[PDB]
Design a protein around this ligand. Structure first.
Ligand SMILES: [Ca+2]
Ligand SMILES: [Ca+2]
Length: 86
């Protein structure tokens, strides 16, 4: 696991990770695909209750990405987004 990610991901409980994975899995054919599209990214985040803004999604893509998002990148983006609730 990339070490920066390791402590965004330490904010999440095992149960949150499992829930997040079940949503993510809806948007891939997991038997052959490990990434969702950048278009799908906001859809999975909204499925999980987050409401990222269009400028934010591009920003997270620029800052987190290693047009695609895999599961650990997705976890980091969820953790970032969870911190902008009001
Ligand atoms: Ca739960
Ligand atoms: Ca559930």
């Amino acid at each position: 696991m990339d070490d920066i990610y390791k402590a965004a991901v330490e904010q999440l409980t095992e149960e949150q990770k499992n829930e997040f994975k079940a949503a993510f899995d809806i948007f891939v054919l997991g038997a052959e695909d490990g990434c969702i599209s950048t278009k799908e990214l906001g859809k999975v985040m909204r499925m999980l209750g987050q409401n990222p803004t269009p400028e934010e999604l591009q920003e997270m893509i620029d800052e987190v990405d290693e047009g695609t998002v895999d599961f650990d990148e997705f976890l980091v983006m969820m953790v970032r987004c969870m911190k902008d609730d009001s």
